[PDB]
Amino acid sequence: ARNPIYFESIQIGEKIEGLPRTVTETDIWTFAYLTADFFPLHTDVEFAKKTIFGKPIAQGMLVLSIALGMVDQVILSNYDVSSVIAFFGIKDVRFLRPVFIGDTIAASAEVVEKQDFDEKSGVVTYKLEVKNQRGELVLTALYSALIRKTP
Amino acid sequence: ARNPIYFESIQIGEKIEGLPRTVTETDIWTFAYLTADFFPLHTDVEFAKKTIFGKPIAQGMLVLSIALGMVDQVILSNYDVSSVIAFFGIKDVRFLRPVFIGDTIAASAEVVEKQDFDEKSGVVTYKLEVKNQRGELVLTALYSALIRKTP
Numbered sequence: 001a002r003n004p005i006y007f008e009s010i011q012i013g014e015k016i017e018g019l020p021r022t023v024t025e026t027d028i029w030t031f032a033y034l035t036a037d038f039f040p041l042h043t044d045v046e047f048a049k050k051t052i053f054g055k056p057i058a059q060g061m062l063v064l065s066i067a068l069g070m071v072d073q074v075i076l077s078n079y080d081v082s083s084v085i086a087f088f089g090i091k092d093v094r095f096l097r098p099v100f101i102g103d104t105i106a107a108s109a110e111v112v113e114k115q116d117f118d119e120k121s122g123v124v125t126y127k128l129e130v131k132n133q134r135g136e137l138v139l140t141a142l143y144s145a146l147i148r149k150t151p
Numbered sequence: 152a153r154n155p156i157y158f159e160s161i162q163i164g165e166k167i168e169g170l171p172r173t174v175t176e177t178d179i180w181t182f183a184y185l186t187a188d189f190f191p192l193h194t195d196v197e198f199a200k201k202t203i204f205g206k207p208i209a210q211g212m213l214v215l216s217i218a219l220g221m222v223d224q225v226i227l228s229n230y231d232v233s234s235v236i237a238f239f240g241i242k243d244v245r246f247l248r249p250v251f252i253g254d255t256i257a258a259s260a261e262v263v264e265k266q267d268f269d270e271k272s273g274v275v276t277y278k279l280e281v282k283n284q285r286g287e288l289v290l291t292a293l294y295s296a297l298i299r300k301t302p
Contacts, residue, residue: 021187030185034178035220040232052236060238061219065212069186081191085203087211090244095237 018070169221
């Protein structure tokens, strides 16, 4: 981690490129364990065969979590995040394409909006994009964080 | 695990009550492992002390995931979900209050909207509400699923 980033330092257009990783069975099962949610499309081989997907697929919440995660990993190793006060919200999430057990997803975040909040902080809005190994857009989202203003 | 529910069976106002569970350290760490995201507010005892929260807190994505999970668990054990085609999207997620390591969260989902989609299915929108052990509302969200229409 280098130096902290304040609200004024963040400028619309900046993009963060996360490190790609192959979604795996272990990934799917871990998420299912953690959420105690075994929806058959994700964890029932027999059930998946009769669906429009034919094979089992990753949970959308899993892809979103891994995405936000690999993006934050870049910020975490380049800035002092003490100025990142809170995760404000997630305004939009669209599950476009399914992610299969051997797909390699890559996420990117771009600053698209900034709003003043109070005398000590402002909210920054990011556009999240997740693509698979063949460039296809599998997931898209809009999320925002409340970050501290310079002293 | 009995009979399938089609679009027409779902009526606005129906509410699903999830089974409560105490968010734990193991929960936080598991989510951090899975997403390879170790944001200090969640996994750095020393860092958390200097924040507006004082103690470490659960990740918002974790609370959301566990919430959707305990709600789906109820549907999963009462209906044949072969009619649940896909997770359409999450429209709004608001992180209202922080969840601490010893808190017990409970989630509920209520059908708030229905829209025809095609001749074989329609989308149902649910309002998600997560409350802690003392009734406080920690998280709120709007999500929708595409479900099959009666044959």
